[PDB]
Design a protein around this motif. Structure first.
Motif, PDB file in Angstrom:
ATOM      1  N   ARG A   1     -28.306 -30.012  -7.705  1.00 14.60           N
ATOM      2  CA  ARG A   1     -27.520 -30.811  -6.770  1.00 14.60           C
ATOM      3  C   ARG A   1     -26.379 -29.989  -6.144  1.00 14.60           C
ATOM      4  NH1 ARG A   1     -23.325 -33.515  -9.555  1.00 14.60           N
ATOM      5  NH2 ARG A   1     -21.717 -34.117  -8.033  1.00 14.60           N
TER       6      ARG A   1
ATOM      7  N   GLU B   1     -24.908 -28.615  -2.004  1.00 12.91           N
ATOM      8  CA  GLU B   1     -23.598 -28.987  -1.462  1.00 12.91           C
ATOM      9  C   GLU B   1     -22.636 -27.810  -1.277  1.00 12.91           C
ATOM     10  OE1 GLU B   1     -21.762 -32.301  -3.505  1.00 12.91           O
ATOM     11  OE2 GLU B   1     -23.585 -33.531  -3.402  1.00 12.91           O
TER      12      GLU B   1
ATOM     13  N   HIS C   1     -16.942 -28.501   3.664  1.00 12.67           N
ATOM     14  CA  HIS C   1     -16.059 -29.517   3.090  1.00 12.67           C
ATOM     15  C   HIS C   1     -16.118 -29.584   1.566  1.00 12.67           C
ATOM     16  CE1 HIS C   1     -19.929 -31.751   3.444  1.00 12.67           C
ATOM     17  NE2 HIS C   1     -19.571 -32.102   2.222  1.00 12.67           N
TER      18      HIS C   1
ATOM     19  N   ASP D   1     -15.850 -29.471  -2.327  1.00 14.29           N
ATOM     20  CA  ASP D   1     -14.644 -29.455  -3.140  1.00 14.29           C
ATOM     21  C   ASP D   1     -14.977 -29.072  -4.568  1.00 14.29           C
ATOM     22  OD1 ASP D   1     -12.100 -29.812  -4.310  1.00 14.29           O
ATOM     23  OD2 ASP D   1     -12.270 -32.009  -4.325  1.00 14.29           O
TER      24      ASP D   1
ATOM     25  N   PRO E   1     -13.641 -31.066  -9.017  1.00 14.53           N
ATOM     26  CA  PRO E   1     -14.122 -31.765 -10.206  1.00 14.53           C
ATOM     27  C   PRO E   1     -15.009 -30.955 -11.142  1.00 14.53           C
ATOM     28  CG  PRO E   1     -15.317 -32.513  -8.275  1.00 14.53           C
ATOM     29  CD  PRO E   1     -14.238 -31.599  -7.780  1.00 14.53           C
ATOM     30  N   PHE E   2     -15.144 -29.653 -10.892  1.00 18.45           N
ATOM     31  CA  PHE E   2     -16.086 -28.824 -11.647  1.00 18.45           C
ATOM     32  C   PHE E   2     -15.433 -27.611 -12.310  1.00 18.45           C
ATOM     33  CE2 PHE E   2     -19.442 -31.303  -9.830  1.00 18.45           C
ATOM     34  CZ  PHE E   2     -19.132 -31.479  -8.482  1.00 18.45           C
ATOM     35  N   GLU E   3     -14.291 -27.808 -12.967  1.00 17.97           N
ATOM     36  CA  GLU E   3     -13.467 -26.682 -13.436  1.00 17.97           C
ATOM     37  C   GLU E   3     -14.199 -25.662 -14.306  1.00 17.97           C
ATOM     38  OE1 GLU E   3      -9.761 -27.806 -15.283  1.00 17.97           O
ATOM     39  OE2 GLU E   3      -8.921 -25.784 -15.083  1.00 17.97           O
ATOM     40  N   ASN E   4     -15.030 -26.157 -15.215  1.00 17.50           N
ATOM     41  CA  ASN E   4     -15.767 -25.318 -16.151  1.00 17.50           C
ATOM     42  C   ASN E   4     -16.854 -24.482 -15.476  1.00 17.50           C
ATOM     43  OD1 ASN E   4     -17.542 -27.761 -15.846  1.00 17.50           O
ATOM     44  ND2 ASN E   4     -18.764 -26.716 -17.407  1.00 17.50           N
ATOM     45  N   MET E   5     -17.068 -24.719 -14.182  1.00 12.38           N
ATOM     46  CA  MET E   5     -18.168 -24.096 -13.449  1.00 12.38           C
ATOM     47  C   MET E   5     -17.681 -23.092 -12.438  1.00 12.38           C
ATOM     48  SD  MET E   5     -20.943 -27.057 -12.690  1.00 12.38           S
ATOM     49  CE  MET E   5     -21.341 -28.372 -13.843  1.00 12.38           C
TER      50      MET E   5
ATOM     51  N   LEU F   1     -11.754 -33.458   2.567  1.00 13.51           N
ATOM     52  CA  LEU F   1     -11.583 -34.887   2.842  1.00 13.51           C
ATOM     53  C   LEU F   1     -10.158 -35.345   2.535  1.00 13.51           C
ATOM     54  CD1 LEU F   1     -14.944 -36.495   1.618  1.00 13.51           C
ATOM     55  CD2 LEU F   1     -14.194 -36.117   3.985  1.00 13.51           C
TER      56      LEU F   1
ATOM     57  N   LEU G   1     -12.421 -41.989  -4.299  1.00 12.58           N
ATOM     58  CA  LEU G   1     -12.446 -40.528  -4.412  1.00 12.58           C
ATOM     59  C   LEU G   1     -11.123 -39.974  -4.960  1.00 12.58           C
ATOM     60  CD1 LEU G   1     -14.345 -38.049  -3.881  1.00 12.58           C
ATOM     61  CD2 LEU G   1     -13.083 -37.768  -1.719  1.00 12.58           C
TER      62      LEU G   1
ATOM     63  N   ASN H   1     -10.513 -38.210  -8.702  1.00 11.06           N
ATOM     64  CA  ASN H   1      -9.975 -36.851  -8.727  1.00 11.06           C
ATOM     65  C   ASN H   1      -8.663 -36.718  -9.478  1.00 11.06           C
ATOM     66  OD1 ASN H   1     -11.828 -34.941  -7.554  1.00 11.06           O
ATOM     67  ND2 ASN H   1     -11.514 -35.955  -5.581  1.00 11.06           N
TER      68      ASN H   1
ATOM     69  N   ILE I   1     -11.613 -37.967 -13.502  1.00 12.10           N
ATOM     70  CA  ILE I   1     -12.142 -36.630 -13.778  1.00 12.10           C
ATOM     71  C   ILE I   1     -11.323 -35.870 -14.821  1.00 12.10           C
ATOM     72  CG2 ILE I   1     -12.666 -34.318 -12.823  1.00 12.10           C
ATOM     73  CD1 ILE I   1     -14.935 -36.165 -12.447  1.00 12.10           C
TER      74      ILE I   1
ATOM     75  N   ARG J   1     -18.871 -37.402 -12.534  1.00  7.08           N
ATOM     76  CA  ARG J   1     -19.133 -36.490 -11.436  1.00  7.08           C
ATOM     77  C   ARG J   1     -20.196 -37.029 -10.469  1.00  7.08           C
ATOM     78  NH1 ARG J   1     -19.353 -30.915 -15.066  1.00  7.08           N
ATOM     79  NH2 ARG J   1     -17.128 -30.363 -14.960  1.00  7.08           N
TER      80      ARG J   1
ATOM     81  N   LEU K   1     -18.720 -39.781  -8.277  1.00 11.19           N
ATOM     82  CA  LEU K   1     -17.736 -39.227  -7.350  1.00 11.19           C
ATOM     83  C   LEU K   1     -18.414 -38.720  -6.077  1.00 11.19           C
ATOM     84  CD1 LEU K   1     -14.842 -36.651  -8.092  1.00 11.19           C
ATOM     85  CD2 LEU K   1     -16.603 -36.182  -6.391  1.00 11.19           C
TER      86      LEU K   1
ATOM     87  N   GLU L   1     -18.253 -39.808  -1.989  1.00  9.42           N
ATOM     88  CA  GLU L   1     -18.159 -38.814  -0.924  1.00  9.42           C
ATOM     89  C   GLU L   1     -19.124 -39.140   0.192  1.00  9.42           C
ATOM     90  OE1 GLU L   1     -18.839 -34.744  -2.209  1.00  9.42           O
ATOM     91  OE2 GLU L   1     -16.797 -34.349  -1.447  1.00  9.42           O
TER      92      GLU L   1
ATOM     93  N   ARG M   1     -18.516 -40.170   3.988  1.00  5.53           N
ATOM     94  CA  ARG M   1     -19.105 -39.302   5.020  1.00  5.53           C
ATOM     95  C   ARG M   1     -20.223 -39.985   5.806  1.00  5.53           C
ATOM     96  NH1 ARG M   1     -17.706 -34.432   5.298  1.00  5.53           N
ATOM     97  NH2 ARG M   1     -19.681 -33.809   6.301  1.00  5.53           N
TER      98      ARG M   1
END
Ligand SMILES: O=c1ccn(-c2cccc(C(F)(F)F)c2)nc1-c1ccnn1-c1ccccc1
Ligand SMILES: O=c1ccn(-c2cccc(C(F)(F)F)c2)nc1-c1ccnn1-c1ccccc1
Ligand SMILES: [Mg+2]
Ligand SMILES: [Mg+2]
Ligand SMILES: [Zn+2]
Ligand SMILES: [Zn+2]
Lengths: 315, 315
Positions: free
Chosen positions: A13, A17, A22, A24, A27-31, A227, B273, B277, B281, B302, B305, B309, B313
């Motif tokens: 997924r 994206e 755009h 963001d 939300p995916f800090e560990n990645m 956004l 959203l 955030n 999250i 996640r 969320l 979006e 959009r």
């Protein structure tokens, strides 16, 4: 842990994206470390750096961003991602060496930031200003990048010839220097004229460096292209850093400028307005003229400008 | 009424689904009391509480939730189930006393809620605000819990020593207070530092208290962690209730904030959203770090969320 990054796989997924402007990372800090690896791999190839060295470099770069409100690890990756999307949409405009350099440079462009502007350091005779008289922090950032590169097993540019090793350091150096907003205004002004007269030529090296400059600015400021609720939140982190600086000045007896004055929050909406009109809009406008597929950046920016205008009207 | 509950057997076709973090109780209304029984039996044993007292208690709890759009009986059981799933997936970490207390706490955490926030009550000088100056509803919730325990034939902690009784009421009390979202922010912040410094020690009772609190917050918000069609619909209940509070302010004639203002219906997606955030999250992110097995909560969060979006959009 620096090993766990090697067996990282980006979820399907996210593969879709990550290509959009755009996107963001928030939300995916560990990645984030893994996201940089992926982006470098898609832009430059999987056999471009040695994975071991690349992963050691990235982890060391994260370690050397501080726990400040805005100029942190999150910011580094945010800026790298936008560059990625610029590169991906204008791929063959740039050479392999440039894409390597610009991505790494974006990741490193604020290394070891302390939460203080160039003004502060210079005004208060901090040693960094004695060492670096113009573009104070940005010169330190580049100095920080070289230091990491020269650590054991950290030299990701070891496969390069001497000639290409120097070329890439110079690409990175100009790129980091260019993120000094003090230098943006002149740069954007020149480019506007070259575009108007039709004299902009990408095979002219100095024109090329100017374009890359503008690219670095666009990426540094891209959080104004996310956004509305994302930009709003980032604004809090930005202003949390400014106010912390202004407070340091008030302790030292001297009154800060409104932007850095936590007692002047009322002025913020109009300050954002001024920033969008004088800096951010003309930035992405000039960029869209040169690199038309960067249009979504200008588009999003205009949306957020429009939002701030509603705040000033009373919503 | 309590007697038909003693007879209740959960249908086998839900014996596995119930263990899933994303389990939705929604289609099984008249099974909600039995589901709680079941979860208590599996996590604490069938020997924990006297079956008659336990059944009497649950039915009094049910009747003391009001017919409000969101803070009602359904939410109580939804929150209890999430706690169930956490405790199941961390089999060894929590004591018998903790598990007993936490499930009861979740089911009781919003008792006799009036569909009004704390600031509303403090603003308009409600007797409860005059009674409890901070964490107003939460102190009332616990009060309602103790009242039902002290009803005749309802003290499910009859077979506990004086000391264990005191401990379990302390566990319940702290857990209910922690569901005050105002206190969440401070708690998560402390916990992040403790993980970051590596100073988090679960032998430390006041560290357990913090961890329990985060789990409370997690369970309380867990409607953001269900499958999209379930999350999307629960949102409508939440805002129905926000808007009724605003309407009450507009009946009195005062301007509510946009979240509670129903002349801001269109901004709900953006408002979601932002909340994911700034609040959801980081909650499940810090929980997942402390308790790795709870990872499916963050993953689900996640996914929802990105759904919002798409809504913003127009996808
Ligand atoms: O939202 C903002 C309001 C003001 N400034 C700003 C900053 C510096 C100078 C000036 C000056 F206008 F004074 F030259 C304005 N930057 C941002 C902003 C939006 C995205 N990144 N940054 C950013 C850029 C640089 C530093 C911090 C934040
Ligand atoms: O979907 C939501 C949108 C906003 N809020 C919210 C609530 C309080 C404060 C703030 C503030 F933004 F002001 F901090 C935001 N909560 C939820 C939500 C999602 C799941 N449970 N709840 C919830 C949580 C608490 C109360 C009601 C509903
Ligand atoms: Mg910088
Ligand atoms: Mg509550
Ligand atoms: Zn920067
Ligand atoms: Zn609740």
């Amino acid at each position: 842990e620096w090993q766990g990054l090697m067996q990282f796989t980006l979820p399907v997924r996210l593969c879709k994206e990550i290509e959009l402007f755009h996107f963001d990372i928030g939300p995916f800090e560990n990645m984030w470390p893994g996201i940089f690896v992926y982006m470098v791999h898609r832009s430059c190839g999987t056999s471009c750096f040695e994975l071991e060295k690349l992963c050691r470099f990235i982890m060391s770069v994260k370690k050397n961003y501080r726990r400040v409100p805005y100029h942190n690890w999150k910011h580094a990756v945010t800026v790298a991602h936008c560059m990625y999307a610029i590169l991906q949409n204008n791929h063959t405009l740039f050479t392999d060496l440039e894409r390597k350099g610009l991505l790494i440079a974006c990741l490193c462009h604020d290394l070891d930031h302390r939460g203080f502007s160039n003004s502060y350091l210079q005004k208060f005779d901090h040693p960094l200003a004695a060492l670096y008289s113009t573009s104070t922090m940005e010169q330190h950032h580049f100095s920080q990048t070289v230091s990491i590169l020269q650590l054991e097993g950290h030299n990701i540019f070891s496969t390069l010839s001497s000639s290409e090793y120097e070329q890439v350091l110079e690409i990175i150096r100009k790129a980091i220097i260019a993120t000094d907003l003090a230098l943006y205004f002149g740069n954007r002004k020149q480019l506007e004229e070259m575009y108007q007269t039709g004299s902009l030529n990408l095979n002219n090296q100095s024109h090329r460096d100017r374009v890359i400059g503008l690219m670095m600015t666009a990426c540094d400021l891209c959080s104004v292209t996310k956004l509305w609720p994302v930009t709003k939140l980032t604004a809090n982190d930005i202003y949390a850093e400014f106010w912390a600086e202004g407070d340091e000045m008030k302790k030292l007896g001297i009154q800060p400028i409104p932007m850095m004055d936590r007692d002047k929050k009322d002025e913020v909406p109009q300050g954002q307005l001024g920033f969008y009109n004088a800096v951010a809009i003309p930035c992405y406008t000039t960029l869209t003229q040169i690199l038309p597929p960067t249009e979504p950046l200008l588009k999003a920016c205009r949306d957020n400008l429009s939002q701030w205008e509603k705040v000033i009207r009373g919503e």
